[PDB]
Each structure stands twice: as structure tokens, then as C-alpha cells.
């Protein structure tokens, strides 16, 4: 019954609340996407656009929650770029060892940070890992986590090493499948990093709309924004 353009009209305020809260670049992308839905001819076109708003918005609220910079997909560093600029003396060996798996060089996680296209800087990798493991242990939230480790090497107290933190996030119904597939994809490069002597942590997590509002990986305020906007939109596209 309701035309798609009319569906966007009734959700004007929830989506304006959404755009106001997201980071600058994240908000513009979701706004452009919203206008594609409003002008969409086919139901397939509108659905695909809404899917992308769902992911882009969620990642914008993940950045705000963790005080990380939101990075558009286009500006996101690959693994190869991270090794070249953070571990330049090992980039050659990184290339040689990825001869049989060259796709590894192009892996682009949602967040690619290193300890303090550009790799972002974070004050403590282990603090981020702990935060994730705490919420996982406290609210039962599925995560997967892996750390490079050359042979059986001990951590050390007399010298610091550079290290990377690789993070995958997502907003989708199959949370367990998301984190299982992410860690499987990265297990290969973790093993590679071990053999190069490069310290990396990989973390993956996911939320869906059935998650209790106080239990997401994003602030509860942001949960209400997504639920009142993109989530309702999906319900309206299906009925109409």
C-alpha cells in the first residue's frame, strides 16, 4: 500500500535523529543512501540500500562508543598497507610468504589499528582486548579473539614491540556465524604473523536487534537510534 517514498516520509524524524548522532562522514553516507531508498524504483533496490545503511550506521556508532575514528570503506587500510608502514623491515618477507595467498594482502578489516589510508593509533591494544573479553564474559556476548605468537614465545618486560589490532564488527541476525566466519578468515594471517614475528590481535563481535538494549557493543542511546530508524524501515518495506 504505502509507497516507498511515503515510508521514508513517516520516518523523517527517526532518521533525522540518526543522522544527527552519527560521525560526519558516516552521516553523509547514510543520508545519500536514504535518498536512494526514497527515490528507489524496485523493492530490491530499496532493500539493498537499507542493508548498507544498517551496516554503515552501526559502524559509525561502534566508532563513537569506543572513541575510535570512523573510516569510510574507501579509506580503510588493508593488511598489506599496515605491514608496509608499521613493519617496513618485514614487508618483503610478508610479500614472499603471501605468494600462495595473495588475497591476504588485500584483507581490509573494519578497524586496523597499531599501538601508539592510515593505520589508526590506540593507546593500549590489551585494554581493548580486555574490554571485549569482559563484556563477553559478563553478558554472554559471542566474540572470537586470536593473538599472533611466534612458537611459544613469552611476553617480555625490557623492550616494547609494535603491534596491530584488527577488529571486525557487524549488525546482523546470525551473530555466532558472523564471528565464526571472521576468525576463520583471519586465522591464516595470524599464523603468518606468528612466522614473521609480528604481534597482532584479531577481534570480532556482532549485534542483532534481539540483543537486550543494555547489552550491545554500542551505547544504548545509539541502540534506540538504530531501532527507531533503520530497523522500523525494514519492517515497513516488508509489509508494503
Amino acid at each position, epitope marked *: 500500500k504505502k509507497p516507498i517514498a511515503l515510508i521514508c516520509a513517516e520516518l523523517y524524524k527517526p532518521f533525522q535523529d540518526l543522522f544527527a548522532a552519527l560521525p560526519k562522514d558516516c552521516s553523509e553516507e547514510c543520508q545519500t543512501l536514504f535518498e536512494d531508498i526514497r527515490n528507489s524504483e524496485s523493492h530490491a533496490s530499496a532493500w539493498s540500500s537499507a542493508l548498507r545503511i544498517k551496516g554503515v550506521a552501526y559502524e559509525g556508532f561502534f566508532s563513537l562508543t569506543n572513541s575510535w575514528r570512523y573510516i569510510p570503506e574507501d579509506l580503510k587500510p588493508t593488511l598489506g598497507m599496515a605491514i608496509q608502514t608499521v613493519f617496513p623491515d618485514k614487508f618483503e618477507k610478508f610479500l614472499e610468504r603471501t605468494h600462495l595467498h595473495p588475497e591476504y594482502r588485500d584483507f581490509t578489516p573494519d578497524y586496523l589499528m597499531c599501538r601508539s589510508i592510515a593505520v589508526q593509533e590506540v593507546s593500549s591494544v590489551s585494554a581493548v582486548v580486555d574490554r571485549f573479553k569482559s563484556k563477553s564474559s559478563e553478558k554472554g556476548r559471542p566474540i572470537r579473539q586470536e593473538e599472533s605468537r611466534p612458537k611459544t614465545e613469552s611476553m617480555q618486560e625490557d*623492550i616494547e614491540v609494535d603491534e596491530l589490532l584488527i577488529v571486525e564488527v557487524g549488525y546482523q541476525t546470525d551473530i555466532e556465524g558472523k564471528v565464526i566466519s571472521d576468525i576463520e578468515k583471519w586465522k591464516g594471517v595470524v599464523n603468518l604473523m606468528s612466522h614473521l614475528g609480528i604481534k597482532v590481535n584479531v577481534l570480532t563481535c556482532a549485534d542483532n536487534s534481539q540483543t537486550p538494549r543494555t547489552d550491545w557493543w554500542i551505547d544504548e542511546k545509539y541502540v534506540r537510534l538504530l531501532l527507531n530508524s533503520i530497523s522500523y524501515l525494514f519492517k515497513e518495506l516488508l509489509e508494503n
Partner: antibody
Amino acid sequence: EVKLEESGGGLVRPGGSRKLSCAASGFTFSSYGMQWVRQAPEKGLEWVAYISSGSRTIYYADTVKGRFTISRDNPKNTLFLQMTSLRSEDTAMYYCATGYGGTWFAYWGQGTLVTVSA
Amino acid sequence: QIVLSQSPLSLPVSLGDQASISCRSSQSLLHSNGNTYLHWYLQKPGQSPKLLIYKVSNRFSGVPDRFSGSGSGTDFTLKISRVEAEDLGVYFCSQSTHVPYTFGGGTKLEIKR
């Protein structure tokens, strides 16, 4: 002067439990990893456990895994070893130690004797 | 686990002579951070162990300069340039590159008479 002072040793029945403490002084305890090392009578040294300064990283010898827990209280400058399911093979002098800047054993306590026997 | 093999098991040496103790590692002790965590201890009879040398060749502060260490990879040596009566006891190498940290079996330094 750096000093480590173990306590809590004594006699335990096999299968029993015992908690060791180590009081640290003379340096900023909270900044450094701490370790437990043991020595069975007339035998060599055997490393037991390591705990990082912020307790984030913990390592155990394979013979104590599942039975011993290392922990610390940084405000109280104290290191702990909680021992459970003790066996006669755990009879030993227990030393706490620290590298005061690394994973080597630069400083050692005087040790505390734990005897596991019925 | 890393196995550390000390030789000889016991070392008779006259006062004033040099002593050399060898420590062989079952795998390289070079850490990916560039350091080599092989260390040397002395346990005098009835006392707790004492650090002599850390990371291969660094004499611990206050250790007599007659003690020195050398080596790389899997092959390491502790030298006492001129043995004194106080050096009686058991010398241990140990490594902290890999978990578990492990000790050599000990070399007893015996004073020749």
C-alpha cells in the same frame, strides 16, 4: 634495597591446599612481573608461574596447570601462590623472584619450605 | 619445552684458574623482539640462587667482574676468569624466551685441592 619475603610454607596432606605469600619492598612492585620458582630437596630449580604487572598475562609450568593459581595485590605489594590438589612431588622450597625489569630472576626471596606428606 | 643441556655436570678447578661452563639450547633462544633471554645463576650451598648474567652477556649489577657470558642462538658459555673459593656451588643456565621458562640441570663447581 629490594627484598622479597615469602611466607605460608609448612606441612600439607596430599590432596590438600596451601597459599603462599611474598611481601615485596624496595621497588615499585606494581610495575613489574613476579614469579614463583621451586626446588625439590637436592634437585635443580624448576620454574612455577609468572604474572605480569597488571595481572593480564599469566603463565604456568605444565606440572602445576589446573592446580596452582598465581595472583597479586599491587596496593599491598604482595604476590600469592594458591596451591591445591598438592602431591608429594610438590614438596619443595618455594621462592618468589622478579626481574625488576625483565623475565629473568634478578631478585630472589629466602624461600619457604612446603612439605606434602601424610 | 626448551631443553637446556649444561656441560660438564661437575667442574673441578684450582683456585686462580679459569672455569668454563657450556649451555646448549634445544632451539634458538633468539626472541622475535631481537633479544636472547639466556641467563646464568649461582646457587651457593644452603643459599637461594643469585643472578650472575642476564641476556647472554650482561653482568648483573654488583656481580664480580670475573664472571662473564657469551654465545648466541643455541650455544652459550659462562666463564670465570679466575676462580675464588666463594665460587663453590651450582651454576644454572635458564631461558625466558619461551614459555615454560626452563633451567639447565646445574653444573657443580668443585674447588680442586
